[PDB]
């Protein structure tokens with residue numbers, strides 16, 4: 001469509017191959033990416049330039065990821081910034097080498113708590129809230145229900161370890177005490193026995209879905225369920241995770257009432273976003289584009305990530321026209337330190353309303369919203385939301401319920 005216009009090239013890094021489990025995120029977010037790019041092209045928002053997104057398959061592999069990045073630099077056009085990075089290890093290797101290349105990176109799916117280190121990854125940004133974002137939200141929930149004595153059950157895996165350790169920092173001046181800290185790698189039954197021995201009533205769990213069935217099976221035999229107990233665990237599990245299989249009836253008896261915590265895929269506010277669409281109008285539109293592609297909960301973040309990139313380039317263009325004798329953006333060979341500086345500062349100024357809510361960074365980290373769910377009878381039900389920017393907890397009244405006439409005591 002754009003004949004005389006120079007391209008603003010972006011290096012899209014993600015697993016796209018069907019030969020890799022995580023390639024579904026890449027493929028699932030592609031319709032959202034195309035929707036933001038079609039509108040940017042139709043209305044020519046980068047006039048007289050155009051958005052040139054180039055895609056490179058990381059294949060969710062460390063070696064392959066690094067080769068795709070280097071091949072993109074060597075034989076590809078002049079990329080102004082990096083868009084993507086899904087698998088934690090692949091994103092960490094690439095992000096480590098950005099400053100040397102004058103390349104600002106924006107990820108929509110890499111949730112690892114590790115990438116928060118702006119001493120190691122100074123040129124890395126992300127629209128998606130990190131795994132640690134659940135902690136301030138959890139802290140707000142505990143104070144709301146006067147649960148000042150908790151116990152923690154963590155899986156001995158980096159993903160979960162990093163979240164549990166960040167929790168120690170979050171609870172500093174807070175009137176909350178972790179009367180018990182338990183760990184496990186293969187079997188949680190021993191740690192659950194210990195929590196019951198220590199008389200723990202409110203449990204903060206950090207483990208995968210396979211381990212969750214084991215935890216709830218142990219909880220049943222140890223009587224750690226019902227009216228006197230409250231489990232707070234990851235909300236990102238698969239709809240029928242428990243159906244994938246103690247007996248299944250006992251597993252459900254121990255599951256009943258548990259609270260799920262995860263990031264909110266899309267905002268519930270009916271406000272017009274930066275695109276000029278509401279999060280609900282974008283969702284229906286996204287659903288027509290996918291055409292059975294399968295849904296990714298990171299689609300909203302990817303859509304917003306493209307809008308962050310376009311607004312960053314719009315700001316970068318304004319700055320360059322203000323600085324005489326050097327405004328040839330299309331010419332950026334990775335040498336320009338000043339160009340990277342301008343892009344970096346322009347992304348740090350991001351503050352707009354996206355499909356995933358208010359898009360704001362705090363040292364390259366997203367200030368987003370956290371979703372609270374509860375397992376009632378046969379499915380998880382949305383029981384509230386946490387706003388990171390405002391530090392606001394809003395519990396949907398007449399949804400969250402307890403086994404007794406009132407919430408359990410700590």
Ligand SMILES: *[C@@H]1O[C@H](CO[C@@H]2O[C@@H](C)[C@@H](O)[C@@H](O)[C@@H]2O)[C@@H](O[C@@H]2O[C@H](CO)[C@@H](O)[C@H](O)[C@H]2NC(C)=O)[C@H](O)[C@H]1NC(C)=O
Pocket residue numbers: 345348349350351360
């Ligand atoms: C990186 O950005 C922060 C935040 O920028 C402010 O908030 C944005 C959402 C947008 O509204 C901008 O126009 C704002 O300036 C900048 O830090 C804040 O600066 C204010 C004013 O001096 C200060 O009172 C706050 O304490 C600052 N907050 C922090 C966390 O430093 C910051 O200067 C930017 N950094 C660079 C290197 O450009």
Ligand SMILES: *[C@@H]1O[C@H](CO)[C@@H](O)[C@H](O)[C@H]1NC(C)=O
Pocket residue numbers: 035038039042
């Ligand atoms: C892009 O333009 C076409 C005009 O043919 C229109 O059908 C479509 O809705 C537009 N998409 C966006 C996202 O504005």
Ligand SMILES: *[C@@H]1O[C@H](CO)[C@@H](O)[C@H](O)[C@H]1NC(C)=O
Pocket residue numbers: 333335
């Ligand atoms: C970028 O432009 C400079 C300035 O002349 C040149 O020395 C360098 O080789 C260029 N890089 C590429 C990849 O062409």
Ligand SMILES: *[C@@H]1O[C@H](CO)[C@@H](O)[C@H](O)[C@H]1NC(C)=O
Pocket residue numbers: 395396397
């Ligand atoms: C829940 O209670 C809070 C605090 O009083 C109130 O602001 C909010 O409107 C309530 N929500 C519903 C659905 O009642």
